[PDB]
C-alpha cells in the first residue's frame, strides 16, 4: 500500500507501507527512505501519537493515506 506524509514543511512522500504493518515498521522505511531515525521524529495521525502499538488498520491508515510530522523532540 501506498501513503503519505507531512511535516513543518508540509511536504508529502509517497511510501510503500501495508495496512496490516505496524506502526514502527512503516515508521522504520521511511526512516530507512531518507535515512533518518525515528528517535529524533515521530508520525501523527487523526491528531494523535501514532505508536507500533497497533498497524495502519487498527489506526485506520488506509492507502493514500497522510501523516504529521512532529517538531522533532523537545524543543520548540
Known amino acids: 500500500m501506498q501513503i503519505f506524509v507531512k511535516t513543518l514543511t508540509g511536504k508529502t512522500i509517497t511510501l510503500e507501507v501495508e495496512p496490516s504493518d505496524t506502526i514502527e515498521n512503516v515508521k522504520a522505511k ?31 491508515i488506509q492507502k493514500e493515506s497522510t501523516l504529521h510530522l512532529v517538531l522533532r523532540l523537545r524543543g520548540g
Do not use: C, V
Open 30 to 60: 521511511i526512516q530507512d527512505k531518507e535515512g533518518i531515525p525515528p528517535d529524533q521524529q515521530r508520525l501523527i495521525f487523526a491528531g494523535k501519537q501514532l505508536e507500533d502499538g497497533r498497524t495502519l488498520s487498527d489506526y485506520n
